[PDB]
Amino acid sequence: RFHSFSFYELKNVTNNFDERPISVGGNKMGEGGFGVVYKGYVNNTTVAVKKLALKQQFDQEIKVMAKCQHENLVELLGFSSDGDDLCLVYVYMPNGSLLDRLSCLDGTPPLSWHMRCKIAQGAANGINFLHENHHIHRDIKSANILLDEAFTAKISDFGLARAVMTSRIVGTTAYMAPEALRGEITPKSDIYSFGVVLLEIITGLPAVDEHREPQLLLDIKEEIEDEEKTIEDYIDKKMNDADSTSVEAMYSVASQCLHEKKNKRPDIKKVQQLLQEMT
Numbered sequence: 001r002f003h004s005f006s007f008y009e010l011k012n013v014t015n016n017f018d019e020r021p022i023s024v025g026g027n028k029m030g031e032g033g034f035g036v037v038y039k040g041y042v043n044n045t046t047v048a049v050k051k052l053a054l055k056q057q058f059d060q061e062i063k064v065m066a067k068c069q070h071e072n073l074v075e076l077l078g079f080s081s082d083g084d085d086l087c088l089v090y091v092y093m094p095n096g097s098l099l100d101r102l103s104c105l106d107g108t109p110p111l112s113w114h115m116r117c118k119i120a121q122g123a124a125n126g127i128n129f130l131h132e133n134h135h136i137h138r139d140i141k142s143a144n145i146l147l148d149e150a151f152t153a154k155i156s157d158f159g160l161a162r163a164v165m166t167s168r169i170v171g172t173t174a175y176m177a178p179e180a181l182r183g184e185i186t187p188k189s190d191i192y193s194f195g196v197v198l199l200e201i202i203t204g205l206p207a208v209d210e211h212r213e214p215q216l217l218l219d220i221k222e223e224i225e226d227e228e229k230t231i232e233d234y235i236d237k238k239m240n241d242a243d244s245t246s247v248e249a250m251y252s253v254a255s256q257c258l259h260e261k262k263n264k265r266p267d268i269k270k271v272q273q274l275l276q277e278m279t
Protein backbone atom coordinates (compact mmCIF):
# COMPACT_ATOMS: atom_id res chain seq x y z
CA ARG A 1 0.00 0.00 0.00
CA PHE A 2 0.77 3.80 0.06
CA HIS A 3 2.05 6.05 2.86
CA SER A 4 -0.25 8.39 4.83
CA PHE A 5 1.69 11.67 4.98
CA SER A 6 0.88 14.34 7.57
CA PHE A 7 0.03 17.79 6.12
CA TYR A 8 2.74 19.51 8.29
CA GLU A 9 5.48 17.15 6.91
CA LEU A 10 4.32 17.90 3.32
CA LYS A 11 4.21 21.63 4.20
CA ASN A 12 7.85 21.88 5.44
CA VAL A 13 9.32 19.65 2.60
CA THR A 14 7.60 21.88 -0.07
CA ASN A 15 8.95 25.05 1.81
CA ASN A 16 5.43 26.05 3.13
CA PHE A 17 3.94 25.20 -0.35
CA ASP A 18 6.14 27.89 -2.05
CA GLU A 19 4.19 29.01 -5.15
CA ARG A 20 7.19 30.86 -6.69
CA PRO A 21 8.57 28.94 -9.76
CA ILE A 22 11.62 26.56 -9.34
CA SER A 23 13.36 28.86 -11.94
CA VAL A 24 13.41 31.77 -9.38
CA GLY A 25 14.13 29.52 -6.33
CA GLY A 26 10.64 28.38 -5.26
CA ASN A 27 8.81 25.00 -5.21
CA LYS A 28 6.07 25.31 -7.90
CA MET A 29 6.55 22.87 -10.84
CA GLY A 30 3.28 23.60 -12.66
CA GLU A 31 -0.44 24.20 -12.14
CA GLY A 32 -3.55 22.62 -13.65
CA GLY A 33 -7.32 22.84 -13.22
CA PHE A 34 -7.27 20.44 -10.23
CA GLY A 35 -4.33 21.79 -8.22
CA VAL A 36 -0.72 22.96 -7.98
CA VAL A 37 2.28 20.60 -8.35
CA TYR A 38 5.19 21.27 -5.94
CA LYS A 39 8.75 19.82 -5.71
CA GLY A 40 9.50 18.18 -2.34
CA TYR A 41 12.27 16.35 -0.42
CA VAL A 42 11.27 13.33 1.79
CA ASN A 43 13.88 10.61 2.84
CA ASN A 44 16.60 12.81 1.05
CA THR A 45 14.62 11.69 -2.12
CA THR A 46 12.92 14.25 -4.38
CA VAL A 47 9.10 13.93 -4.65
CA ALA A 48 6.26 15.64 -6.59
CA VAL A 49 3.38 16.84 -4.33
CA LYS A 50 0.07 17.72 -6.01
CA LYS A 51 -1.90 19.86 -3.47
CA LEU A 52 -5.51 19.59 -4.81
CA ALA A 53 -7.58 22.79 -5.53
CA LEU A 54 -12.09 17.12 -7.24
CA LYS A 55 -12.43 14.66 -4.27
CA GLN A 56 -13.67 12.06 -6.83
CA GLN A 57 -10.53 12.52 -8.97
CA PHE A 58 -8.42 12.20 -5.71
CA ASP A 59 -10.07 8.81 -4.88
CA GLN A 60 -10.00 7.66 -8.56
CA GLU A 61 -6.21 8.40 -8.67
CA ILE A 62 -5.66 6.36 -5.41
CA LYS A 63 -8.03 3.50 -6.61
CA VAL A 64 -6.37 3.07 -10.07
CA MET A 65 -2.79 3.57 -8.64
CA ALA A 66 -3.36 0.92 -5.91
CA LYS A 67 -4.22 -1.64 -8.65
CA CYS A 68 -1.86 -0.45 -11.41
CA GLN A 69 1.89 -0.81 -10.72
CA HIS A 70 4.11 -1.02 -13.87
CA GLU A 71 7.55 0.11 -15.18
CA ASN A 72 5.71 2.49 -17.62
CA LEU A 73 3.24 4.13 -15.15
CA VAL A 74 4.14 6.86 -12.62
CA GLU A 75 4.25 5.67 -9.08
CA LEU A 76 2.21 7.24 -6.28
CA LEU A 77 4.07 7.14 -2.93
CA GLY A 78 1.16 8.35 -0.80
CA PHE A 79 -1.39 11.02 0.07
CA SER A 80 -2.49 13.45 2.85
CA SER A 81 -6.19 13.62 3.79
CA ASP A 82 -5.86 14.88 7.42
CA GLY A 83 -5.16 18.61 7.44
CA ASP A 84 -6.53 21.72 5.66
CA ASP A 85 -6.09 20.39 2.01
CA LEU A 86 -5.73 17.05 0.05
CA CYS A 87 -2.32 16.10 -1.39
CA LEU A 88 -0.97 13.34 -3.66
CA VAL A 89 2.73 12.34 -3.36
CA TYR A 90 4.51 10.78 -6.38
CA VAL A 91 7.98 9.56 -7.37
CA TYR A 92 9.88 12.52 -8.97
CA MET A 93 10.32 12.49 -12.78
CA PRO A 94 13.52 14.52 -13.44
CA ASN A 95 12.89 14.97 -17.16
CA GLY A 96 9.31 16.34 -16.89
CA SER A 97 6.72 15.62 -19.60
CA LEU A 98 7.10 14.48 -23.22
CA LEU A 99 5.18 17.70 -24.19
CA ASP A 100 7.85 19.90 -22.54
CA ARG A 101 10.77 17.94 -24.00
CA LEU A 102 9.29 18.02 -27.50
CA SER A 103 8.86 21.85 -27.14
CA CYS A 104 12.36 22.10 -25.51
CA LEU A 105 10.77 24.08 -22.64
CA ASP A 106 13.31 25.99 -20.52
CA GLY A 107 16.16 25.39 -22.98
CA THR A 108 16.48 21.61 -22.67
CA PRO A 109 18.14 19.87 -25.71
CA PRO A 110 15.94 18.35 -28.43
CA LEU A 111 15.16 14.60 -27.94
CA SER A 112 16.98 12.38 -30.47
CA TRP A 113 15.00 9.99 -32.72
CA HIS A 114 16.55 7.09 -30.73
CA MET A 115 15.18 8.52 -27.38
CA ARG A 116 11.79 9.16 -29.13
CA CYS A 117 11.46 5.48 -30.30
CA LYS A 118 12.11 4.17 -26.72
CA ILE A 119 9.51 6.64 -25.30
CA ALA A 120 6.91 5.49 -27.87
CA GLN A 121 7.62 1.80 -26.99
CA GLY A 122 7.52 2.59 -23.24
CA ALA A 123 4.24 4.63 -23.34
CA ALA A 124 2.64 1.75 -25.39
CA ASN A 125 3.83 -0.84 -22.80
CA GLY A 126 2.12 1.36 -20.18
CA ILE A 127 -1.16 1.62 -22.17
CA ASN A 128 -1.07 -2.18 -22.73
CA PHE A 129 -0.73 -2.76 -18.96
CA LEU A 130 -3.77 -0.48 -18.37
CA HIS A 131 -5.85 -2.29 -21.06
CA GLU A 132 -4.74 -5.78 -19.88
CA ASN A 133 -5.97 -4.69 -16.41
CA HIS A 134 -9.29 -3.48 -18.00
CA HIS A 135 -8.71 0.28 -17.50
CA ILE A 136 -9.36 3.09 -20.02
CA HIS A 137 -7.15 6.13 -19.39
CA ARG A 138 -9.37 8.70 -21.23
CA ASP A 139 -6.67 11.42 -21.32
CA ILE A 140 -3.70 9.99 -23.28
CA LYS A 141 -1.64 13.01 -24.35
CA SER A 142 2.06 13.99 -24.26
CA ALA A 143 1.52 16.20 -21.11
CA ASN A 144 0.56 12.89 -19.35
CA ILE A 145 3.66 10.96 -20.45
CA LEU A 146 6.37 11.70 -17.88
CA LEU A 147 10.11 11.04 -18.20
CA ASP A 148 12.47 9.66 -15.57
CA GLU A 149 16.32 9.93 -15.22
CA ALA A 150 16.74 7.37 -18.08
CA PHE A 151 13.92 9.02 -20.19
CA THR A 152 11.70 5.97 -19.56
CA ALA A 153 8.07 6.83 -20.38
CA LYS A 154 5.60 6.85 -17.47
CA ILE A 155 1.82 7.31 -18.09
CA SER A 156 0.36 9.73 -15.49
CA ASP A 157 -3.04 11.22 -14.38
CA PHE A 158 -5.60 8.43 -13.72
CA GLY A 159 -8.16 10.92 -12.34
CA LEU A 160 -10.55 10.32 -15.30
CA ALA A 161 -9.58 6.60 -15.69
CA ARG A 162 -12.46 4.05 -15.97
CA ALA A 163 -12.72 0.27 -15.55
CA VAL A 164 -20.59 2.01 -22.91
CA MET A 165 -21.82 5.68 -22.97
CA THR A 166 -21.59 8.73 -20.59
CA SER A 167 -23.21 12.19 -20.23
CA ARG A 168 -19.99 13.67 -18.69
CA ILE A 169 -17.74 13.83 -21.81
CA VAL A 170 -14.08 14.26 -20.66
CA GLY A 171 -10.58 14.46 -22.16
CA THR A 172 -8.54 16.80 -24.37
CA THR A 173 -10.42 17.55 -27.66
CA ALA A 174 -7.16 17.89 -29.70
CA TYR A 175 -6.40 14.17 -28.89
CA MET A 176 -9.97 12.71 -28.79
CA ALA A 177 -11.41 9.99 -31.07
CA PRO A 178 -14.65 11.01 -32.90
CA GLU A 179 -16.66 8.48 -30.80
CA ALA A 180 -15.12 9.82 -27.50
CA LEU A 181 -16.44 13.30 -28.49
CA ARG A 182 -19.91 11.69 -28.96
CA GLY A 183 -19.87 10.08 -25.50
CA GLU A 184 -18.61 6.51 -26.06
CA ILE A 185 -16.30 4.96 -23.41
CA THR A 186 -13.95 2.48 -25.15
CA PRO A 187 -10.21 1.45 -24.95
CA LYS A 188 -10.17 2.10 -28.76
CA SER A 189 -10.40 5.86 -27.93
CA ASP A 190 -7.02 5.60 -26.02
CA ILE A 191 -5.47 4.11 -29.21
CA TYR A 192 -6.61 7.17 -31.26
CA SER A 193 -5.14 9.56 -28.63
CA PHE A 194 -1.83 7.61 -28.80
CA GLY A 195 -1.79 8.15 -32.61
CA VAL A 196 -1.75 11.92 -31.96
CA VAL A 197 1.15 11.40 -29.48
CA LEU A 198 3.08 9.51 -32.22
CA LEU A 199 2.47 12.47 -34.60
CA GLU A 200 3.85 14.87 -31.90
CA ILE A 201 6.94 12.63 -31.56
CA ILE A 202 7.63 12.53 -35.37
CA THR A 203 6.98 16.30 -35.90
CA GLY A 204 7.78 17.98 -32.59
CA LEU A 205 4.53 19.97 -33.13
CA PRO A 206 1.85 20.48 -30.42
CA ALA A 207 -1.54 18.62 -31.00
CA VAL A 208 -3.29 22.03 -31.24
CA ASP A 209 -1.97 25.45 -32.29
CA GLU A 210 -4.68 28.05 -32.83
CA HIS A 211 -2.21 30.15 -34.96
CA ARG A 212 -1.31 27.25 -37.33
CA GLU A 213 -2.82 25.73 -40.53
CA PRO A 214 -3.93 22.99 -39.85
CA GLN A 215 -4.81 23.92 -36.24
CA LEU A 216 -5.09 20.23 -35.24
CA LEU A 217 -2.04 17.97 -35.80
CA LEU A 218 -4.31 14.94 -36.55
CA ASP A 219 -5.29 16.80 -39.79
CA ILE A 220 -1.80 16.26 -41.33
CA LYS A 221 -2.80 12.56 -41.88
CA GLU A 222 -5.37 13.86 -44.44
CA GLU A 223 -2.72 16.16 -46.05
CA ILE A 224 -0.28 13.20 -46.40
CA GLU A 225 -3.01 10.73 -47.60
CA ASP A 226 -4.32 13.24 -50.17
CA GLU A 227 -0.61 13.71 -51.37
CA GLU A 228 -0.89 17.49 -50.63
CA LYS A 229 2.14 17.02 -48.25
CA THR A 230 4.68 14.26 -47.28
CA ILE A 231 5.63 12.77 -43.88
CA GLU A 232 9.23 13.99 -44.65
CA ASP A 233 7.90 17.60 -44.90
CA TYR A 234 6.62 17.28 -41.29
CA ILE A 235 9.60 15.42 -39.60
CA ASP A 236 11.07 17.41 -36.64
CA LYS A 237 14.18 19.24 -37.93
CA LYS A 238 15.58 19.34 -34.36
CA MET A 239 16.93 15.78 -34.88
CA ASN A 240 20.15 14.55 -36.56
CA ASP A 241 19.43 10.75 -36.27
CA ALA A 242 15.90 10.36 -37.77
CA ASP A 243 16.17 7.49 -40.25
CA SER A 244 13.53 7.79 -43.10
CA THR A 245 12.47 4.10 -42.89
CA SER A 246 11.87 3.97 -39.11
CA VAL A 247 10.11 7.44 -39.23
CA GLU A 248 7.86 5.95 -41.97
CA ALA A 249 7.28 2.79 -39.86
CA MET A 250 6.22 5.02 -36.87
CA TYR A 251 3.95 7.22 -39.11
CA SER A 252 2.23 4.01 -40.43
CA VAL A 253 1.45 3.00 -36.75
CA ALA A 254 0.16 6.58 -36.08
CA SER A 255 -1.98 6.48 -39.33
CA GLN A 256 -3.45 3.08 -38.18
CA CYS A 257 -4.30 4.43 -34.64
CA LEU A 258 -5.99 7.47 -36.27
CA HIS A 259 -8.46 5.40 -38.28
CA GLU A 260 -11.80 7.27 -37.85
CA LYS A 261 -13.65 3.91 -37.46
CA LYS A 262 -12.69 2.51 -33.97
CA ASN A 263 -12.93 -1.16 -35.15
CA LYS A 264 -10.41 -0.57 -37.97
CA ARG A 265 -7.77 0.75 -35.42
CA PRO A 266 -5.26 -1.85 -34.07
CA ASP A 267 -5.45 -3.00 -30.44
CA ILE A 268 -2.67 -1.87 -28.05
CA LYS A 269 -0.87 -5.35 -28.33
CA LYS A 270 -0.66 -4.86 -32.15
CA VAL A 271 0.69 -1.31 -31.53
CA GLN A 272 3.53 -2.68 -29.29
CA GLN A 273 4.40 -5.36 -31.91
CA LEU A 274 4.54 -2.69 -34.67
CA LEU A 275 6.74 -0.31 -32.58
CA GLN A 276 9.05 -3.30 -31.72
CA GLU A 277 9.44 -4.27 -35.45
CA MET A 278 10.35 -0.58 -36.14
CA THR A 279 13.65 -0.92 -34.12
Ligand SMILES: CN(C)[C@H]1CC[C@H](Nc2ncnc3[nH]cc([C@H]4CC[C@H](C(N)=O)CC4)c23)CC1
Nearest residue numbers: 029030037048050090091092093096097156157
Ligand atom coordinates in the same frame (compact mmCIF):
# COMPACT_ATOMS: atom_id res chain seq x y z
C1 LIG B 1 4.11 21.81 -17.45
N1 LIG B 1 5.22 21.06 -16.87
C2 LIG B 1 6.24 21.95 -16.30
C3 LIG B 1 4.77 19.90 -15.96
C4 LIG B 1 4.42 20.27 -14.51
C5 LIG B 1 4.05 19.04 -13.65
C6 LIG B 1 5.12 17.97 -13.74
N2 LIG B 1 4.79 16.78 -12.96
C7 LIG B 1 5.69 15.95 -12.37
N3 LIG B 1 6.98 16.34 -12.39
C8 LIG B 1 7.87 15.51 -11.84
N4 LIG B 1 7.65 14.35 -11.21
C9 LIG B 1 6.35 13.97 -11.21
N5 LIG B 1 5.85 12.82 -10.68
C10 LIG B 1 4.49 12.83 -10.80
C11 LIG B 1 4.09 13.94 -11.49
C12 LIG B 1 2.67 14.31 -11.83
C13 LIG B 1 2.09 15.29 -10.78
C14 LIG B 1 0.63 15.66 -11.10
C15 LIG B 1 -0.24 14.39 -11.19
C16 LIG B 1 -1.70 14.73 -11.45
N6 LIG B 1 -2.58 13.81 -11.07
O1 LIG B 1 -2.02 15.79 -11.99
C17 LIG B 1 0.32 13.47 -12.28
C18 LIG B 1 1.76 13.07 -11.95
C19 LIG B 1 5.27 14.73 -11.72
C20 LIG B 1 5.37 17.58 -15.19
C21 LIG B 1 5.81 18.77 -16.04
